[model samples]
Target: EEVDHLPIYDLDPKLEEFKDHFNYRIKRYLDQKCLIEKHEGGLEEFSKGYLKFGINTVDGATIYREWAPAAQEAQLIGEFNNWNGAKHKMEKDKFGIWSIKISHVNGKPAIPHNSKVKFRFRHGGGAWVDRIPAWIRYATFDASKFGAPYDGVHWDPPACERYVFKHPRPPKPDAPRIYEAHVGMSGEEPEVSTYREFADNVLPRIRANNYNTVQLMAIMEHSYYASFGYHVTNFFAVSSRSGTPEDLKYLVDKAHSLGLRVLMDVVHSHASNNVTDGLNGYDVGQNTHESYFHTGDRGYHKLWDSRLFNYANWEVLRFLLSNLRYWMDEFMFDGFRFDGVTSMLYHHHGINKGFTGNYKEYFSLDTDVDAIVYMMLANHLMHKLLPEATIVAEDVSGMPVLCRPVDEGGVGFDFRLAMAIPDRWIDYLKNKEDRKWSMSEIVQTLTNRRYTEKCIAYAESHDDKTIAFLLMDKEMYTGMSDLQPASPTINRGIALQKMIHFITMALGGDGYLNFMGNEFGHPEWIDFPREGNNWSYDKCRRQWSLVDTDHLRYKYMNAFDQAMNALEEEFSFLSSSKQIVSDMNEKDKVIVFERGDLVFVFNFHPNKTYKGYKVGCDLPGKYRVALDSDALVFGGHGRVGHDVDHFTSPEGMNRPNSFKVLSPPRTCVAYYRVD
Candidate 1:
């Protein structure tokens, strides 16, 4: 009756209803070049289409190939020919691909490196147009020029100067302790940073903080700077705002040298709606056989003001899939975090609809079946090509089977961002006071994901409604100095910040992520240079001087973050699935839990200390105070001794054995079994 029974349905019988999707998508994946498509070569050769598609320089000539199915004629125009369209008219193949081979003059490349280029096209009933190459490897932009298009630069560096990757990609993290950073804002100086500068400065900070993975954000080249690199104009190019592609390779190589996995923040969900400079075009003709994007209302993202991808088209798949392989094979990025996934998965695009965990909503006709099939192909191809590739989905939709294996009737993402946990933190800070906080609700948010699916837990994402900024909005610049008397706001923000990070990491998800600036209570939230703020760099960059000054409380928080990660590195708690919330003491403002061999006790009371608190545990033995949030070095009053040992007795409340400890105010203490 069916092509095959699915393994995902075993998680819930409700999933059996979507067996058709399970059937179709799996076939779509299995039949790629593996079974259905009659290819001269398989995926390996198809992925190398990048080497064939873009501007390639060989022994005696330079060749350029672009897909424009609807074009009647085309010409290559660029700086080399002084923007003249007199010669180099490209020839078209039956397959609708246009090409031109410019022979080398005196055995030299006719199209020099870093020279600007554009294609002129003529289609039926359409005005002649100039557009950037679809497979352009690098692009340059200017913000000063109003409505100015990004210039497509031919970036073929010489063999002797091109950066060669020296270090191999680090092994996939057992526990991906990720540090999410924006290279543009990485500099302590008040401007954009180079990739080499970030490699020199930030990678050491990440390694010192014990993060095994670096999730680089805002990397894909976007025309509009304020869009934060979300609205990508170029798919094959790295953001030239930072540096050259070689510099990026050097950055990745340096990260690999430091035992860090570098993950590119990839935006394949949509493209900027730039007709000439981007994919949204009349390159072939406005709504003609340009298969890269959608045609009508379905093609444009109203909310994002961008063009949605046409995932089912064969050439589109080749461009996107090959782009992925290009980054992996050439630049040596460890993997990717697919951004704006919710926008891709549904026709509704997650607009004005609450998911409410209904299976029908996910399985209905409103779903983008083509997009799902594409994701299945994307994930399957990456893992097969690079076994250690860690593909994470930034899907707010919480789509079922999002992080499962593709062969098992799932989309095959390695992890999904735990979107709700960050939302809950936002809600608590916005509405409730400290005393009104619900311990049960907090724990429920952290431990709420489906068991079989893995999630990357985080307190805040790049879109930071920063907890630190929110906490000390008033006294950020004033009381941070040790010369001044301690302010209530500063004290509260510092104490709560550590607990927030500690709690989220201890029980939040399969992996944990911390945003770069927030790791050290970076005083202000990220507000990029824009017209609204008079184009100021004041709040755009990181202020590392805050931590450099020994008087500032920011140093304490920085060390605490490092120590917390060091602890996770030792216990390997993130890799273990065993999380037991033994106690949610709402009245006492305390939440205790057990993760593997360690027991966590978090007391959130502002002014009260619970003496001899009984924390339940599964094991009976001597428990040593492994993590003390109230230590003197942590900017806390040393009420509880870090050297104190707690003996678990047979009589207990929840887990049979219990340990007694002096729980201090606003402290999170963790205990580990010694024997």
Candidate 2:
């Protein structure tokens, strides 16, 4: 039976340039699935790597399994046997899988629930070394405790103990209005915050802001905290610094109860280079890096100082796919935002080269088909188990059909991050003057995206410097304190900040994301505790006091953010069709567009305010001001009235609908039309 469905080429004729490669990869995907079925019976059976391997308790006995193909001998060395390697030996199978069962040895319990464990491996050259088990759920390191050679602790909780979910998960939002947050730095304290603290303190703020989804970053366990959880050492364990495993579950359950979907910022692109805790050199006597990664220079990610994964290896796929399933099944994460997708999609890692919008750039030999297939399989398994689960790709290269369905000969992802939007805004702000800004260019930048796929637009993320500080660098440094009327520079910065946010949300992408504190124009860049800063947590934390203070203008900016997001929620203009530009004047520094039932007008001029600025609309009706960025409540000078209304009439050039309104300089206004 031939499966019949419209391919990506049908959905996007532009994909016709790489039609052959696309079809070939689709066949390879199907063939791989067939092979998996033939070898392991079914996908459910094939995905049982996590369940079968690792330390599992069966029939009132503890069992341990390890996958070390090159190891000649293995033994369980832990607190149960007083760190004796020869007490309990592991039997090896032909497939290089080592296993051992710990029941009643000498009429006593062999391994208790809280016993620390490590594997002693004897390689072909008779080299002996200890390694942490790859699939241990809970791992911790104590700097002062120096008894054992291994760093991991064998976490076997009592069978009666579990984190019971109190509330069901919220339905995935149609368009992800994501709040990308880091758990450690979410608090106002000058130290790392826990998952419990984030749940109690930050989740409410996210819900209050009308954001439906929370994209949590730095969840995976890493040895170093300053890496921001990207240098993942143990893919299975939640970061101990945040809290216990149950604490994370509590956070997720709490978020779900609040009707906020949680997305994991999963980093499968690379692994930490740490040998003691990471998978870089798991096999002790092995000279080559062939087990989990590629050999030679191909295995290293020079930019990140991490080890790139070899997606072609079966064991690697099983490990990664099992890790993905474990998070969804164990922790109940609603979805994932795959980080470093552009790096994984290409062999060159998209370093230093501009991706010219040519079809050949996507289908060249530089493309990593193995990684692409792995992504397809990951998406396939995710959607197969949880159909409504979302998957976002952080692909800056703009690979065609990245968000398309796998059945359509494309990697299946729900959305891709609009990485360029923030960069464009930042570049303009840093290099260009206000007079050099072009209305036409602004419109094009906001609307330029793949038609079929959705995007999560943001002004800035944790990777970039603070967007607020970037916009008002000098003004913020000088006049942000006890000023009565505010200086001219401060006023300009405040006004443009509101206008930029409103326009970006209105026209940028289907979804919107804001970093932890950027909502209220939080000042300063984020710097984790490192040696360069004398190991200080001063810049690592979010200062909620800025917005909490009644005397400051930050509260007003936060009020505007709430209003903007509320308007988006009510209108749902982003989920609707692409915006249609009604008017654009380069010299006047004004742009007008229509999306859904609202008309948006943005005035970018530094000094020019126009009275009765007529902007044409497609719908003929009475329009009222829905939101005014220049309103008094939003820290604006109250240049425009929010209660104003205008009725469209037949105007010049046979225009059926043209509404006139007072446009304030460096302000934005949205009109809700009465049907």
Candidate 3:
């Protein structure tokens, strides 16, 4: 008799720990990831069914149609109705589509902006309730008192003209330089910053830094600001905390004008599930969770302290899918960077668990295929709606097909954030001294790539408590005098900081990202409005003046970043960032690599400066100093000059003729081919 089983179950220890839970979470996450890759093939198939919303012109009148299955009756109750409960009630069609064609003399003959409507959902005799359309363009509040109910309708004056972008904008480029920014905390002062302010003030900053994309965080209205925009309450309405919807549109228009695309950091993995402002208990007859999320404790994420949706529910899927479409269609966002995807992919919330190399772990029966399918559907719908839109995943677990096409059984994301790169940098900075750093290890950490995949890399983002929060002023400032602007500690920090960023952009991964003030190294951590901080916006906001003033050292870092990014655009380094060599001397703290004819050399030695150091390269040509980290413009001591020339390999030797100069302490330099 042949043996029947291989004891694969016993080999997987975690299978016994959570058993069904472990198997379920992994398989579900993978299945979804795979589904996206598979379903991407069918993206064009769904475009025919993809819904479209707009007003049709019929001579003197305009026709309007809205798709709502649950509504027994719908009405356009706004300033046009004198804020009346019902005037232009929509007629229900045979297909449950409610539509009304209104004859207008001027424009659409309806309420102007800031107007709202409540759909009347009636079940029985006199049993009717008015609920706000899940998707509303504009929202406002009575600031005299906090937490007051929003007016059912408010009339914003008609616009003089719709602003159009001047540039012939494409959707967005691959390997985009994304600047993750928050509008509320964009101001230099403690006052609340509006979306308009960010558009005018921050847009130029982004353009100057050579970033092509902007990730606007916390745009969706959330009641609690301290959650860092994670605890979102309203899915449809733009944050009244900032400005009007038109203001947001204008911001996007401004970004498009500068050839910068806009992306919302969509927190769709979970929801607040609050009754007052959220979709938790909107309907009184039925439990909101019954139709929206999984029942029982499994539906809730105990670790994140948020409610998880039941993706198996088609209605829930529709709600989320509709939300995604609304942002892309109405707000004109290029795409969304889906946040907290790891939490959504697992029932255990990815806590206290290690991903062992096991196929069984990735193909378990406990997988939530429904959620996976929904993701595939949403991503498919996104591209179907807007062909050039970009969708990115913030997933930690290297879930297969997470960035693959839906038809190949994956979640169709254009790119996945290389979340580990930042962590690796943080770990090195915290545990290892400058002398102890190894070049080979840095290259390994940065060049670790997925097969046939794209990634967005960064030295530090909004996470890791930011660079300013980790380093104390005492660590960077030994002697402070008004007469002298540069400090030794500051110099070292600025140099290494630039080197780390250059390596990250060129070798760590594909695309690159930086937070709003990270280009110039914002000096403090971001702490949003909270009771502990006395509701102060001081630490939360960006200190633009620090980089604006030429007197400070921030300008040097900013200038370096500007040059690096500009060079990327001019030379397209991000598309071809790959290291040909990774030679290291741990004792001397020297690391060298060549990225596409551009040679990157880093000397991390605290005191040792090696003369005529030979860095290995394969390029055969005359090399000149294209950029140097030790340049005085970036607060360096002018250690390396642009006058040196390097020759090609001699006598049929494969390795190029590369000779290095005396590298200063903790400095880096780049030499590129002149011919």
Top-TM-score candidate index: 1
Q: What's model 3's overall lDDT?
A: 0.69
Q: Candidates' lDDT values, in order? A: 0.85, 0.83, 0.69
Worst window of 10 by summed lDDT in candidate 1? 281-290
Query: Cα RMSD for candidate 1?
Result: 1.9
TM-score of 3: 0.83
lDDT of 3 by residue, 1-675 (tens): 111221323433343544454344445545543553475333333222223222334566655554455556666555566645465778877745567777875555554545554545554445555544444444455657665445433323455644444444455675688898999889988877899999999999999888999989988877677777887766666787788777788898888888898899888888776554555434344443434556567667787676778786534655677678778866788999998877766666556557663545444553455566677777878888887888888877766556776544356788888877887778887787766677777877787667466888888887436564344345433322224765666666777778878888888666888988888877757787688878887787888887876667778889999988887786676777445764677888887777765777888887777777777666566777777878888878887767877765553432445555557877877777776
Per-residue lDDT of model 2, residues 523-615, tens digit only: 888898887888899888998988887878888778888888889888898798847887888899999988877888999999999999998
Alpha-carbon lDDT of model 1: 0.85
TM-score of each: 0.97, 0.95, 0.83
Model 2 alpha-carbon miss at residue 57, Å: 0.9
| lDDT ranking, high to low | 1, 2, 3
True lDDT of residue 602, candidate 2: 92
Which rank order by TM-score, best down to worst? 1, 2, 3
Q: Tell me which residue pairs clash in candidate 2.
A: none
Q: 1 or 2, which is superior by TM-score?
A: 1
